[PDB]
Amino acid sequence: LDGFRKWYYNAAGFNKLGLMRDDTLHETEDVKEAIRRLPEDLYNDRMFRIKRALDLTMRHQILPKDQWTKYEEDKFYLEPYLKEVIRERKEREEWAKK
């Protein structure tokens, strides 16, 4: 399962643009709240990575293979911050339900 997940990570292809996994999340309301709660350095790296991926998609290029994002290396930075947004979101929802 670990090797097949690495193969699927190579087949997804966002590592060839230098992106992380959390860069590829669709910005819903909860995702934008989690992005707003990021520290300044992580937010700046995320915006630069997104801008570089957009430039590479503009020129129809990819990064060199040494510059790709290694599956093992990818960091799920937004995840911790996101869970909270969802948790808080649900708590609020439940309160209203009841």
Partner 1 sequence: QDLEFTKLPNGLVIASLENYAPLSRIGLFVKAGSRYEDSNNLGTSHLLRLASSLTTKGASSFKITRGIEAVGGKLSVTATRENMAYTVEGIRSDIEILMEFLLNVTTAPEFRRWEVAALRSQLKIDKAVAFQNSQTRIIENLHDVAYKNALANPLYCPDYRMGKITSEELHYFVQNHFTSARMALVGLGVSHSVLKQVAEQFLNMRGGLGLAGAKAKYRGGEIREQNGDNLVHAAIVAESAAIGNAEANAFSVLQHLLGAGPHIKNNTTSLLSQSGSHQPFDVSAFNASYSDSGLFGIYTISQAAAAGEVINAAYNQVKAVAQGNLSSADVQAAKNKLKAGYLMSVETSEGFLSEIGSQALAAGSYMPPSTVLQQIDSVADADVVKAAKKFVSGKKSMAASGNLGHTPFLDEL
Please report the DSSP string for 7-32 in residue order.
Answer: HHHHHH-STTTT--SGGGS---HHHH
Region near partner 1 per CB under 8 A, out of 2-10, 46-54, 65-73, 84-92 = 84-92
Are the beta carbons of 30 and 87 closer than 8 angstroms?
no
Does residue 92 interact with partner 1 by CB under 8 A? yes
CA-to-CA dists, residue 68 to 26, 27, 30, 88, 95, angstroms: 21, 23, 28, 35, 45
Can you tell me which of 39, 64, 72, 97 binds partner 1, judged by CB under 8 A?
A: 39
Can you tell me which of 11, 73, 95, 97 binds partner 1, judged by CB under 8 A?
A: 95
Smallest separation, CB 37 to partner 1 (Å) = 4
Judged by CB under 8 A, how many residues of this single chain contact partner 1?
8
**Running DSSP on this structure, what letter comes out for residue 67?**
G
Does residue 79 interact with partner 1 by CB under 8 A? no
